Ligand binder design. Sequence first.
Ligand SMILES: *Cc1cc2c(cc1C)nc1c(=O)[nH]c(=O)nc-1n2C[C@H](O)[C@H](O)[C@H](O)COP(=O)(O)OP(=O)(O)OC[C@H]1O[C@@H](n2cnc3c(N)ncnc32)[C@H](O)[C@@H]1O
Ligand SMILES: *Cc1cc2c(cc1C)nc1c(=O)[nH]c(=O)nc-1n2C[C@H](O)[C@H](O)[C@H](O)COP(=O)(O)OP(=O)(O)OC[C@H]1O[C@@H](n2cnc3c(N)ncnc32)[C@H](O)[C@@H]1O
Lengths: 577, 577, 104, 52
Amino acid sequence: MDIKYDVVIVGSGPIGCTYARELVGAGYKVAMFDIGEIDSGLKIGAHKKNTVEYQKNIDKFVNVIQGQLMSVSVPVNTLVVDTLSPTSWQASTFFVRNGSNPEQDPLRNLSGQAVTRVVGGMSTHWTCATPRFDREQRPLLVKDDADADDAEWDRLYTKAESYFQTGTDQFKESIRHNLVLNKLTEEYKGQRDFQQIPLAATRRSPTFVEWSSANTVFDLQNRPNTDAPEERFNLFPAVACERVVRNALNSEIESLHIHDLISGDRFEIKADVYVLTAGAVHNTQLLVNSGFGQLGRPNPANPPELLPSLGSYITEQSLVFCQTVMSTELIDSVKSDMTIRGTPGELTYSVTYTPGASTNKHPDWWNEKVKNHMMQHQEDPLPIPFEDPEPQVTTLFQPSHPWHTQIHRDAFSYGAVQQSIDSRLIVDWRFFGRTEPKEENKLWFSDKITDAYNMPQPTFDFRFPAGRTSKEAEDMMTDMCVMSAKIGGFLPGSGPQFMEPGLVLHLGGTHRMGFDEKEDNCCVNTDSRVFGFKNLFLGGCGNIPTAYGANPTLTAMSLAIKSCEYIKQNFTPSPFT
Amino acid sequence: MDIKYDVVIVGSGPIGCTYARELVGAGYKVAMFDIGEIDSGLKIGAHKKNTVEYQKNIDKFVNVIQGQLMSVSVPVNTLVVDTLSPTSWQASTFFVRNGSNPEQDPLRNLSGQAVTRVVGGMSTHWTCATPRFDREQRPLLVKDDADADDAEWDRLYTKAESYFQTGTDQFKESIRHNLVLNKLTEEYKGQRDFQQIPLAATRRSPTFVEWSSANTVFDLQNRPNTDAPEERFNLFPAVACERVVRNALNSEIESLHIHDLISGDRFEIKADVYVLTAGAVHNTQLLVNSGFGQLGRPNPANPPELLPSLGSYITEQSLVFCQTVMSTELIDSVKSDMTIRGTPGELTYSVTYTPGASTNKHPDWWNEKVKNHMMQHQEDPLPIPFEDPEPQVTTLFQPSHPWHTQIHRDAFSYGAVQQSIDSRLIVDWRFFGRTEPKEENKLWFSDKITDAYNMPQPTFDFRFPAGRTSKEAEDMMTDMCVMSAKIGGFLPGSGPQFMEPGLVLHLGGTHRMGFDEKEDNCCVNTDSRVFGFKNLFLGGCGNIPTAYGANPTLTAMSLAIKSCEYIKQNFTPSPFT
Amino acid sequence: VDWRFFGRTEPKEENKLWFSDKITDAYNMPQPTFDFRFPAGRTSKEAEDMMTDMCVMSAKIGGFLPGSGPQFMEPGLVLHLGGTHRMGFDEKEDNCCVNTDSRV
Amino acid sequence: NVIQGQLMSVSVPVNTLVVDTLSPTSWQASTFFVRNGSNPEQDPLRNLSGQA
Ligand SMILES: *Cc1cc2c(cc1C)nc1c(=O)[nH]c(=O)nc-1n2C[C@H](O)[C@H](O)[C@H](O)COP(=O)(O)OP(=O)(O)OC[C@H]1O[C@@H](n2cnc3c(N)ncnc32)[C@H](O)[C@@H]1O
Ligand SMILES: *Cc1cc2c(cc1C)nc1c(=O)[nH]c(=O)nc-1n2C[C@H](O)[C@H](O)[C@H](O)COP(=O)(O)OP(=O)(O)OC[C@H]1O[C@@H](n2cnc3c(N)ncnc32)[C@H](O)[C@@H]1O
């Protein structure tokens, strides 16, 4: 730890790692600070679900997720407990207790919004779904040249996909996957396309998928090292970055103020380039703490001098959810090519098929798996092999169905009576809707209340916009109920529901990109540079200005790639002395 | 990966690390294998709660615990779900589903028993309570000499305490701690002694306690290294140890059969000394898989050839629990030394005390904290500082109250109205009973069903013994009810209750120690050596043959230290080159 | 607003109400026992169509009240049990117990 | 409440819910015996459980 670098990056999630990957590799002397610590093993910032124990026991992974998600803004609790002993101490009012935020209107909250403070950020636990946005969801990078805009976006996404190791083949031989995919494909022939969810992941064996994360983008090892003897990189965990220091002219950042949480020491760190990749809530926090926007409850009678649009036009996706139990029809289809003489268990119960036969509804890798299962586990009443991977099916966002869909399984906590149902029968449905950007939808920071790190307390003022957003969310719910019914019935206790606002986590627009500060009501340009500042960049979902349904990280990563191109063209690395 | 070692240890929990610390330090070439992986940061096997994020948000830590506890034996589920859609596939029977164990009588289970597979074992999440056993609970090490027995235990316990960094001073200036301590002291005066729980922990700051773990006992770094150039140690994570190979005479182990879970390869590893420290359940399973005891439902018509006591006499503590909300009388007493004039939130508000006054009920450090809190946070209705540490109180096991007590706070999930009560008010009560060892209480392993690692499925045949154990469990419940009432009334939803059997996780006696195999119905001698075998040692709670109430890990470590003494005198380390 | 959609269930011989010859109810009469499943085919297919229809229709009035989203109710909680002593024109041909005068 | 007060279940299968946090002093059977008016004839998977 010295205190002069070429580039400093705040945050070690996958957007921060994008910047590290590009600028380390191009020869800059880089330092990255994370307020969290290293805790995913020896591959720094890797996916926590890549242990053999979670590949065997995926439902336990919900606990790991919950364990690193900390609610952003909890209103004051007003539940009445009146069965306390009369000897117990009790207040007369619902006072500010337990970390709750008295600035928060409970009725204008994103109660499910949460943040993770670990090296690697949320990419240590994410679901790894990495779809591209289509034009309707996607910010413009070129005005008035739709084919140029498209070429640019194709180039950046292809790069982003290579950093993440995105692919659509990891589940190709799952029987449940193909059963669901083929059924939906048939039911929506000529109306919608289904495919595998694009997933940042690499299959290593029939029972092991290596999920991608920050570590996949950039391995986060300090450099120089044997494998990179000419690169220069230092990661400093358990360091809070508190603010950037602006010059009087508001044209340049002069330093970053940090606080080492283990030692207690404070430093001012100097760089040529400053990159904030602390997440959509914490980028905005650090910026308000640095004198951008304004602190306290906003008021249009006093608009801020710098970045008046910061923390407005915030967007969060609507999310509807359910689970189904596979239809009898679809389970019987699995064994459609099988001849079954005799009675299960006993002497010469037999199950056979004819390879190659073109009466066969199924391929022979399928039939072989089903045969071997039914022959070797004669006591089991289902034709699906016990280690068959889960479905990972999508029909992507389109104008006639403007929502993203995931028809799959991920980490989930089943009641003791959904533990009653064979897991092979269960499919999760998650449909994600787009939310229109509205100036009145805000994230702001108290001037009186502070969080666990003593920083200004984030407060939401949010409601799903009236109009198209609200009507679409209700159309999306119905579309889920209609679609799901083709695969099976609802699992009791996991019927169709809206999820808690913000629980999706895909918060956008807090520090949004546009061409022109005033006209596009934005904070950064298309290079992710903060308006008026030569040397300050922001990365993450906070940059996305549009209403989007699909999972946004690949889009944000693409915008970070473009940002790094500007950096490479405008700043010279220090000579490797 | 070479194949010849002086010593191989199976398991990297605190007991395996005890053996490593001693034997690596004595100059032996040591390999350690764990089926789990490194995932606690760069300090291998360290406590997961030592991140700044968990020191700030202690109650999220219950998630980390749950995420790494996998139930040992789950009976077949018979919950009736009858509101499935008619189109959904439904079995006609409650078949074997979702990893359930059809061998398990649900009414003779330890349903709460769970195992952890990660580097450092359960010591990556444990509560760090490390009391000694008094004579009543403690296995004899010297026969017919209680003073020599005592002297021996004291010497072993003292060394184990240094390895774990056990102390009774880390909460000495907590207001909540001393409030509860002083009150219980006063109330039971002349009848019981109260003290801080002995905790394996080091305070680093007023807001940071470094909880000990396997890492504290042995850092788990491969050697030779810069800090230890003449030592030889290798850790091999993600390796299932499957069998110890017996010679035909049943006098020596000849190799350890392993399975690398990442590469899929199987090897045989050779050592002079084989130490099993895989936990109480997994030590027994490996021995049964190696041909000790017997596979299948036990039958006294066919007692096994080797270690016929293996997996019999198993013990688990009864656990009662509640939470309380602190009494108005005690809260008011926190500020008994203060003079309060004027009105809060205004100029006129003065809180003062007289440092040193002899009529003061509390010492000056306490009064300063209280005055500062009240004066600096005049809107808060409580006199306890926001950052005051939790209570950590015990009255240790005695013949007139034969249970261990913890009066404190640990990780816990508050329902949305327990979130309603200010956390400064809340105290957790856990009392642990001793269970009499009975031959009919058994852990056995299925000859047909296999677990997630393809090993024989553990099955329990357990009921709390009639007579003294049962009588004491109920007396212990009563005593918690009576004692807790002195502090405050119960928190609704957390009234006094017995916890799920085994959820305590202090399983003992599965491979129990004694002096004579037949006479003392045991599996290992006082050096933890398996009877009849020259070179096979078992460490852990499975060795403890007594009924005990207090947390067992320190007792188990003391036994491992003794075992290491025997190894050091009977096996010669290889020359270093 | 509450929404309740009721489907029709095809009569099947295998679907039965019977009475134990050992177990007795609270009035010391033979204990009723059911042997019932929703018939495969049209009945089952219509039940799922009916769920979807409620989901589609109800959305025109408003969204679901949390906790009371679309669900099937416990079988029989409806209490419109039928066919236990069924009417038909001919005992053998119409598999019945009463004629159209409700006479046994 | 009035409706619920005058509705009696026709056929309740034998209950198999495991309660394993009883005090060790409390009496426990070793089987799921016929208890509390349950119908041992009733297959819980072929029932009209809401019939009353
Ligand atoms: C939680 C989760 C997220 C998730 C997901 C499902 C779950 C349960 N599924 C996704 C998937 O299918 N698709 C996808 O596109 N996204 C999905 N996500 C979200 C995704 O993980 C996030 O979008 C992405 O991780 C965001 O990346 P970014 O790099 O911008 O931000 P981060 O991961 O949140 O990490 C930021 C970090 O900065 C640190 N920090 C915060 N404040 C400070 C300060 N003051 N100083 C220094 N560091 C700071 C954090 O600790 C953090 O690691
Ligand atoms: C869960 C926990 C534990 C606990 C506690 C509260 C909680 C929630 N409170 C404690 C307390 O306050 N005081 C106390 O004394 N103990 C308390 N505990 C229990 C304690 O953590 C255990 O007693 C202790 O950790 C036992 O240590 P040991 O070293 O014997 O066993 P382990 O920690 O379970 O580690 C064993 C390991 O071996 C591995 N393994 C298992 N099978 C294999 C095979 N086949 N091959 C190779 N390795 C294997 C595991 O992965 C594990 O790491």
